[PDB]
Amino acid sequence: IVGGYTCGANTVPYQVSLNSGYHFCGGSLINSQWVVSAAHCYKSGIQVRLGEDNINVVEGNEQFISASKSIVHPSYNSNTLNNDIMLIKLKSAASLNSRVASISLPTSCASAGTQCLISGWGNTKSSGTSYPDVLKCLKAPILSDSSCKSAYPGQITSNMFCAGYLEGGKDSCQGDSGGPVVCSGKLQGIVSWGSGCAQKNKPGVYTKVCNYVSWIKQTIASN
Numbered sequence: 001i002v003g004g005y006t007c008g009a010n011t012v013p014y015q016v017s018l019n020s021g022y023h024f025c026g027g028s029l030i031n032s033q034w035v036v037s038a039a040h041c042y043k044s045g046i047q048v049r050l051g052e053d054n055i056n057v058v059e060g061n062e063q064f065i066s067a068s069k070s071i072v073h074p075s076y077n078s079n080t081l082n083n084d085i086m087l088i089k090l091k092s093a094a095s096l097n098s099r100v101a102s103i104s105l106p107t108s109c110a111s112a113g114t115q116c117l118i119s120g121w122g123n124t125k126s127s128g129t130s131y132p133d134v135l136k137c138l139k140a141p142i143l144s145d146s147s148c149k150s151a152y153p154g155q156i157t158s159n160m161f162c163a164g165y166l167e168g169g170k171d172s173c174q175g176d177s178g179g180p181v182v183c184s185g186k187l188q189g190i191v192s193w194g195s196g197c198a199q200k201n202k203p204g205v206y207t208k209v210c211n212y213v214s215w216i217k218q219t220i221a222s223n
């Protein structure tokens, strides 16, 4: 997260860190046994770390659980990143509490101008790599479809939306992929891509979760 602030330990209880010997992507806890992340974060050997704040120090409240299966969306296109969503089932359920809690799925999509909270342990520099130890947060608004398409002509599908600042300086970045975009207490987006990080006129692009609610419910139900 570039231009964000320290969230404060466990203030984002649905945030998870996907770890393969190091933090590589974020995700969101949607129930005690399932996490939603981005399909481009897929790999085997994933350990899901819940209740984290400082990813380099065990401070308490952490729960490390291996992933049992990862289900990448069948129509995921790695070239366009269309349908960049994946579900991870945990080997055992997490113990939910105030520090580890699930976030609700939306019932309607959000409108442009809705303010949302984006968080993660991704790069904090738009020029160079600087990965923080603790969780960073950023408040960003959803942009209109015309501004999004003007910014990324021919690259935005109906399963994506832009959120951010056209003036640059504040944005999600590499390492934040797979993490949550929460607006009014509902998970509306998944950090997916962008051109560089926090560059002027190049806002972040997110997977539009409201278009996948039925798929998520059907898939969880049958697995």
Ligand SMILES: NC(=[NH2+])c1ccc2[nH]c(-c3cc([C@@H](CC(=O)[O-])C(=O)[O-])cc(Br)c3[O-])nc2c1
Pocket: 040, 171, 172, 173, 174, 175, 176, 177, 191, 192, 193, 194, 195, 196, 197, 198, 203, 204, 205
């Ligand atoms: N501006 C944003 N809102 C944004 C959000 C998520 C991103 N995830 C990434 C991202 C970048 C890489 C690098 C690879 C490297 O430097 O080693 C690449 O371009 O392939 C890789 C991943 Br995988 C990302 O998720 N860039 C991102 C940019």
Ligand SMILES: [Ca+2]
Pocket: 052, 053, 054, 055, 056, 057, 058, 059, 060, 062
């Ligand atoms: Ca820790």
